[PDB]
Amino acid sequence: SSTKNGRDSESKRLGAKRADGQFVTGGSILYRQRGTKIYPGENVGRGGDDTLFAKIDGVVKFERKGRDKKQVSVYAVA
Amino acid sequence: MRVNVTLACTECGDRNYITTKNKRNNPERVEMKKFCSRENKQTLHRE
RNA sequence: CUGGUGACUAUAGCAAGGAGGUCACACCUGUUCCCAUGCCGAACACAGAAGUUAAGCUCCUUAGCGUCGAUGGUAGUCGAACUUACGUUCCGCUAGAGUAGAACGUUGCAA
RNA sequence: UGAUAUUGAAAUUCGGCUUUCUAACCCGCACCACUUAUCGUGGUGGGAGACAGUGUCAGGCGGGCAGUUUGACUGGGGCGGUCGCCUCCUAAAAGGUAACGGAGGCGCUCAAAGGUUCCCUCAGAAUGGUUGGAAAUCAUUCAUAGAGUGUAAAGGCAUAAGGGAGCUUGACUGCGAGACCUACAAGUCGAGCAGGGUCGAAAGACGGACUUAGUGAUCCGGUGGUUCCGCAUGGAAGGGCCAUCGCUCAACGGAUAAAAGCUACCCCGGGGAUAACAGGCUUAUCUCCCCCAAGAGUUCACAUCGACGGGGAGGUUUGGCACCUCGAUGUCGGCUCAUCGCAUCCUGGGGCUGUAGUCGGUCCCAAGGGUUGGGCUGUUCGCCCAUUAAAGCGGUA
RNA sequence: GCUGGAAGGUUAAGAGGAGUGGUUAGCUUCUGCGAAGCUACGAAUCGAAGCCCCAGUAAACGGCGGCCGUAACUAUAACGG
RNA sequence: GAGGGUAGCGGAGAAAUUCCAAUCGAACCUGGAGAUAGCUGGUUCUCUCCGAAAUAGCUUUAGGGCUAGCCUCAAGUGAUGAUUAUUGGAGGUAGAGCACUGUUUGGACUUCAGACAAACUCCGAAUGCCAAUUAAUUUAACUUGGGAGUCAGAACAUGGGUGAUAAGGUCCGUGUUCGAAAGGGAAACAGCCCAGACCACCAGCUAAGGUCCCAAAAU
RNA sequence: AAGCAGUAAAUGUGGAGCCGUAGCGAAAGCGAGUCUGAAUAGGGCGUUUAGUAUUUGGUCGUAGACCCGAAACCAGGUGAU
């Protein structure tokens, strides 16, 4: 009697990296994901692995994109 | 089968690249137009 | 008030009944020219006499499907005590029912 | 076993194979002398002879002998299985999270399956036709995804990331503010600046592929380039820097360039951190006791028997776990018949009967006393012989 | 394993030195040739045994099988696939 | 019987690992030598202050080690630490449900009723988590240097896997106590309830738990 | 420092040598700046620019290195009463 299972891969630490209402630097990472669960908003871009990152210095806000969708944006408030 | 090759600049200063190729589909040496570092322009790369 | 372009989770939708036209929109004839078809002026692109509400688009009604949606109660649960399944105190579903609901609103050409 | 030194003289044949000869070298061969000795030496006759023996260099055989290696995890060890990477669940709505827990993949492919610019919308169903499923091509209506997306799964994608055409090679060079992850070594994302470019009318997009797997430190060695060094000077050997190649080093952070077994002839240092005997916890298994009553029983569920299903007690079995004991708790059967429990084998007292009587069956009370001798087998167990009122079942390491 | 054989293949040291590189007396491109010496490598050719091969040997080491039918043997197969 | 021979990388053996000075799977003595021992045992006077861990990664690694986490001392910055109130956000568990993917019962003839799900979702909490430069209370936090120990954990409650909804079983998440904690209660009883011992007193009030006698307080 | 003089002293004398005052780069090299790079363009390491000699305490390294304890290995000898 033996087992065929036992295998798993190293866990990838996905999820949100910055909080709503916080000030971030020029190129801070905001969200790690597979696919598009959250869309890039104002002043926010997508990386090659779907990573969302900021492109200015400002405060970050999570928003709503119509229905069943949502987006995150950065605003340059000083 | 899959094999790796090197592209060398033709009739000019050599600026080398590395890539892969399927030997069945491309039995002959491939040719491309790549940038030459020490000639500061695109040239023809053979092999 | 007809048309152009933007913002709002269908409370904007789908479906049925009805009104209308050469200002605008639109159906319509044709392939000489710029353009085009796995083949086909259907589409795309052009030259435009006339012709039609028949069709798209906007207008009034419509709770027939879709969407929205309280109150009260219930399930679950933070914490506290007893004990092993029961008190007390906050928070508070889902489903269902009473209900909205035939959209509100920005900038300019005219009208 | 071959070459070469000791090793010399002549002469046939395509400096060499091959034949004679004697002087080197050899004789545990005979005779003489030292010498009353035949160890040794010398002389003289015979035998052999450039061979053999010996030195240096080379190839082969070689458990006869020697030095060593022969992995880890593990509900004890051995046997079986697994070891690095990717995706989902257990995972308790941030991240992280174990088990020899439940399921699958990878050690690649693509010269267009890459970049850019335009255009398009799938699967499935009915209707009518050379009728192979009206689904092998055809034209309608219905259809928000059930279609496809190289390859597992998850998350995304109809703005399409899906389908089709034109051009092309950014599957470029030097870099890089900032940030995620993290013991280290590594891994991941990245706006912008400069030099070349492709597509597009232009704004713009392009540092491979919808995303996540397709990989291996250092030392050493090879191939190209180069404002470097080069031991008195000038060169050159030999190094340094840049680019790149060679490991199923898969036990995948990789002991070395190179490695398997037996020990009952065994030894030492430790451990109840870990098994075998007994104790302890549990009761799957075991042994007893009940609930329901389809039925059997000449009719008649319950005198007796009790299918399919359900609920308990005990701690005498085989097991599970690993809490004391490895600076030692002696392991089976027998002799002994001591002491205790009652779920009673005989005796004592009763209810029911499918109890005429003599025997029986089943249930209740009761532990006072009693409960044989032999054959076979180391046996416990078991079969048999002859008796008895009866030849009871269990605990006490 | 042992013994015998040599038709071919593989096979060391040792012999042989076709070519190549380093240096420089002389030339001129004005950073390319280059004789004589010394010096770092050298390949075709010759080279024994062994092994690959051929044969014998078991009182040498060792080895001595399966499925399926069939009466003048009722069950069974003498005999056959 | 006497006199002799064979010596340890050896000798002898009618064969047993048998014998070679009461010792032999390789005799005794003296040297290398204080061999090596990731393994047991031990390590000597007194007060004061602070005070752990039994985890992760890699390992010829598993009762060993190295880096990180947790303790202490000295210097520096200094509000950057903690709790609560308000507002904002990311993330699909409990529950529920059948719109997807599978499973399922009874009626019709695609539809109406009724159920199930870790790897199902049209939905969706309580808690926990990240922030502000927003108030009140409190006392920590970060950086650079010197010195460590730790890598065998246990029980209770609760959320789960495994086992048989067995084990004082085993493997993870979340709190407490023991470890390293004396005192009171539970008869006795490290882990359960109450509660943290600087010293002295023949003073007072309480907690858990109790008040007929042992045994302090209601027959 | 060795040495020399001095009572086996104290300390005279002795300036070979050592650390610091300037870094960066593999090196040639340049220098408050250097390396990479076509380019301070960007980036890395420097421009703090106060050390140095003796000594108390803590820890480390080389020597047996806190103490006691093997089963074994090698070398030279003694033994057949």
**Termini separation of chain A (Å)?**
67 Å
Our Rg estimate of chain B from Cα atoms comes to: 11 Å
Rg on CA atoms of chain A, Å: 16 Å
Q: SSE order of chain A, as H and E?
A: EEEEEEEE
Q: Structural class of the helix and strand makeup of chain A?
A: mainly beta
Q: In total, how many domains does the architecture of chain A comprise?
A: 1
Number of domains of chain B: 1
Query: Which shape of chain B, going by the Cα principal axes?
Result: elongated
What is the element string of chain B, with H for helices and E for strands?
EEEE
Reading side by side through the largest sheet of chain A, how are the strands ordered? 1-3-6-5
Most strands sheet of chain A: 4 strands, antiparallel
Helix content of chain A: under 10%
Overall helicity of chain B: under 10%
Tell me, what's the shape of chain A? elongated
Strand order, largest beta sheet of chain B: 2-1-4-3
End-to-end Cα distance of chain B, whole Å, is 17 Å
Give the beta-strand count of chain A: 8
Number of helices of chain A: 0
Oligomer: part of a larger assembly
* Biggest beta sheet summary of chain B: 4 strands, antiparallel
Could you tell me the strand content of chain B as a percent range?
Answer: over 45%
PDB class: ribosome
Keywords: linezolid, ribosome
Entry title: 50S ribosomal subunit from Staphylococcus aureus containing double mutation in uL3 imparting linezolid resistance
Chain A: 50S ribosomal protein L27
Textual characterization of the structure:
This is part of a larger assembly, with chains A (78 residues) and B (47 residues). Chain A is an all-beta fold and 78 residues long. Chain A has one domain (14-78). Chain A is built from no helices and eight strands. Chain A has a four-stranded antiparallel β-sheet, with no helix packed on it. In chain A, strands 2-7-8-4 form a four-stranded mixed β-sheet, with no helix packed on it. In chain A, a hairpin with a 5-residue loop joins strand 5 (44-46) and strand 6 (52-54). Chain A is elongated and about 65 Å long. Chain B has one domain. Chain B has 47 residues and is mostly beta strands. Chain B is elongated, with a radius of gyration of 11 Å. Chain B has no helices and four strands. The chains hardly touch. The structure holds five RNA strands. Chain B: InterPro entries: Ribosomal_bL33, Ribosomal_bL33_CS, Ribosomal_bL33_sf, Ribosomal_zn-bd.
